[PDB]
Design an enzyme around this catalytic site. Sequence first.
Site, PDB file in Angstrom:
ATOM      1  CE  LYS A 147     -12.894 -29.133 -33.168  1.00  0.00           C
ATOM      2  NZ  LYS A 147     -12.099 -28.367 -32.171  1.00  0.00           N
ATOM      3  CG  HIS A 175      -5.686 -27.731 -38.548  1.00  0.00           C
ATOM      4  ND1 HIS A 175      -5.633 -28.975 -37.960  1.00  0.00           N
ATOM      5  CD2 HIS A 175      -5.987 -26.857 -37.558  1.00  0.00           C
ATOM      6  CE1 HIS A 175      -5.878 -28.858 -36.667  1.00  0.00           C
ATOM      7  NE2 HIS A 175      -6.098 -27.584 -36.397  1.00  0.00           N
ATOM      8  CB  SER A 220     -15.976 -32.853 -33.608  1.00  0.00           C
ATOM      9  OG  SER A 220     -15.078 -32.143 -32.774  1.00  0.00           O
TER      10      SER A 220
HETATM   11  N1  LIG Z   1      -7.611 -36.718 -24.513  1.00  0.00           N
HETATM   12  C1  LIG Z   1      -8.570 -36.842 -25.426  1.00  0.00           C
HETATM   13  N2  LIG Z   1      -9.073 -38.050 -25.721  1.00  0.00           N
HETATM   14  C2  LIG Z   1     -10.030 -38.184 -26.628  1.00  0.00           C
HETATM   15  N3  LIG Z   1     -10.526 -37.142 -27.277  1.00  0.00           N
HETATM   16  C3  LIG Z   1     -10.065 -35.908 -27.029  1.00  0.00           C
HETATM   17  C4  LIG Z   1      -9.067 -35.730 -26.088  1.00  0.00           C
HETATM   18  N4  LIG Z   1      -8.798 -34.430 -26.034  1.00  0.00           N
HETATM   19  C5  LIG Z   1      -9.595 -33.812 -26.907  1.00  0.00           C
HETATM   20  N5  LIG Z   1     -10.375 -34.709 -27.513  1.00  0.00           N
HETATM   21  C6  LIG Z   1     -11.392 -34.446 -28.555  1.00  0.00           C
HETATM   22  O1  LIG Z   1     -10.686 -34.169 -29.796  1.00  0.00           O
HETATM   23  C7  LIG Z   1     -11.555 -33.333 -30.610  1.00  0.00           C
HETATM   24  C8  LIG Z   1     -10.815 -32.045 -30.944  1.00  0.00           C
HETATM   25  O2  LIG Z   1      -9.640 -32.345 -31.695  1.00  0.00           O
HETATM   26  P1  LIG Z   1      -8.676 -31.165 -32.177  1.00  0.00           P
HETATM   27  O3  LIG Z   1      -7.515 -31.041 -31.060  1.00  0.00           O
HETATM   28  O4  LIG Z   1      -7.924 -31.689 -33.508  1.00  0.00           O
HETATM   29  O5  LIG Z   1      -9.379 -29.876 -32.412  1.00  0.00           O
HETATM   30  C9  LIG Z   1     -12.790 -33.060 -29.755  1.00  0.00           C
HETATM   31  O6  LIG Z   1     -13.690 -34.140 -29.987  1.00  0.00           O
HETATM   32  P2  LIG Z   1     -15.270 -33.942 -29.829  1.00  0.00           P
HETATM   33  O7  LIG Z   1     -15.760 -32.652 -30.365  1.00  0.00           O
HETATM   34  O8  LIG Z   1     -15.937 -35.233 -30.547  1.00  0.00           O
HETATM   35  O9  LIG Z   1     -15.539 -34.140 -28.250  1.00  0.00           O
HETATM   36  C10 LIG Z   1     -12.218 -33.181 -28.352  1.00  0.00           C
HETATM   37  O10 LIG Z   1     -13.272 -33.407 -27.408  1.00  0.00           O
HETATM   38  O1  LIG Z   2      -9.312 -20.524 -32.546  1.00  0.00           O
HETATM   39  N1  LIG Z   2      -9.528 -21.096 -33.602  1.00  0.00           N
HETATM   40  O2  LIG Z   2     -10.254 -20.576 -34.433  1.00  0.00           O
HETATM   41  C1  LIG Z   2      -8.953 -22.347 -33.865  1.00  0.00           C
HETATM   42  C2  LIG Z   2      -8.175 -22.981 -32.900  1.00  0.00           C
HETATM   43  C3  LIG Z   2      -7.611 -24.224 -33.166  1.00  0.00           C
HETATM   44  C4  LIG Z   2      -7.822 -24.833 -34.399  1.00  0.00           C
HETATM   45  O3  LIG Z   2      -7.270 -26.050 -34.663  1.00  0.00           O
HETATM   46  C5  LIG Z   2      -8.598 -24.200 -35.365  1.00  0.00           C
HETATM   47  C6  LIG Z   2      -9.163 -22.958 -35.097  1.00  0.00           C
END
Ligand SMILES: Nc1ncnc2c1ncn2[C@@H]1O[C@H](COP(=O)(O)O)[C@@H](OP(=O)(O)O)[C@H]1O
Ligand SMILES: O=[N+]([O-])c1ccc(O)cc1
Length: 288
Positions: free
Chosen positions: A41, A101, A131
Site C-alpha cells: 500500500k 513486498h 490504506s
Molecule cells: N496513480 C496513483 N496516484 C496516487 N495514488 C495511487 C495511484 N494509484 C494507486 N494509488 C494508491 O496507492 C495505494 C495502493 O498502493 P499499492 O499499489 O502499493 O498497493 C492506494 O492508496 P489509498 O488506499 O490511500 O487510496 C491507491 O489508491
Molecule cells: O491479492 N492480494 O492479496 C494482494 C495483491 C497485491 C498485493 O500487493 C498484496 C496482496
Amino acid sequence: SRQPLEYVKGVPLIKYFAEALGPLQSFQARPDDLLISTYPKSGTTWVSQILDMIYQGGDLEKCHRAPIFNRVPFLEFKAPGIPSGMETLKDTPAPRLLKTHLPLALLPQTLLDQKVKVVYVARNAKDVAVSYYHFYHMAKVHPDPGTWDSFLEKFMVGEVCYGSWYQHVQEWWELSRTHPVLYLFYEDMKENPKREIQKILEFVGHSLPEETVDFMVQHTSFKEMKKNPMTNYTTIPQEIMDHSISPFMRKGMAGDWKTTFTVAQNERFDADYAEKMAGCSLSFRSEL
Ligand SMILES: Nc1ncnc2c1ncn2[C@@H]1O[C@H](COP(=O)(O)O)[C@@H](OP(=O)(O)O)[C@H]1O
Ligand SMILES: O=[N+]([O-])c1ccc(O)cc1
C-alpha cells in the site's frame, strides 16, 4: 477462507504467499531485470504503471495488453483460481518488471547477486496503515482485520502481512548504500509526479521527449489509473478482491489518515514511531 497469517523466518505472511516461496526458490534473475519493491500500500501499482509506460516507449495501447498484475509478475503471489507470480513470470518477456513486498530476510538471493536495479517506494506509516486496513477487508485472502483500533495495534507490532513497516523501509533504505536502489516517496510522487518520473527515467537509463513525459504524468494520475481497468484491479476475481467493500484505487491522497486516526491514536503512534525511527536518516512527510 480468511486464513491466519503464517510465519516464516520471522515474517508473517499469507498462507498462499508462504507456499509460493517454494517454487519461487527456483526463480533465476536476469541482469537486466528491474525489481519493484515496496511495503504493501505504498504505491506499488502507481510506480508499476509508470515503469511499464516507460518500458513501452510511452505507448498507451501496449500498456493495455493486459492487467498490471500480469504485465508485472508478483514474485511471491499466489491465490485460488488465478495464475501464480512464478507462472506469470514464465510468459514475461525481458526486460522484465518484477514486484515484491518481501523483506530482505526472504528476498530471493538471485536478485542481490545479479545486482538487479531496484526501485523502492516508501509511504508515511499512517497512510500505509489506513490504506492497508481497508485493503484487508477487500482482499479476501487476508485474515479478518477486526476494528480499526485493533488493526492499528497489530500494525504497530508488525503483526500484519509482511511484518513491520518500520523494519521494511529502514532495511531497504540501508541497502541502497551498497545496492543500486532508487528510493522514492509516495508523497514526493504525489507532490510532483513529473519530477519523480524524470528520476525514474534517469535511473533506468532511458530517455523520452518532454511531450511524452507529460503524457505519462496524465495516465499515471490517480484519476486515470482509477478509470483504467488494466490498473484498477477490477478484472481480478471477486473472491480475491471485492471492490464493493472497498476499491483498490481508494482515495490516492496524502494526509487522508487524519480523518481516521483519533487524537489518542495519533499521540500513542507518534511516540512509538519516535523510538523505532530513532537513529534513522529517513524523513517522512505525513501530509502535503
Ligand atoms: N496513480 C496513483 N496516484 C496516487 N495514488 C495511487 C495511484 N494509484 C494507486 N494509488 C494508491 O496507492 C495505494 C495502493 O498502493 P499499492 O499499489 O502499493 O498497493 C492506494 O492508496 P489509498 O488506499 O490511500 O487510496 C491507491 O489508491
Ligand atoms: O491479492 N492480494 O492479496 C494482494 C495483491 C497485491 C498485493 O500487493 C498484496 C496482496
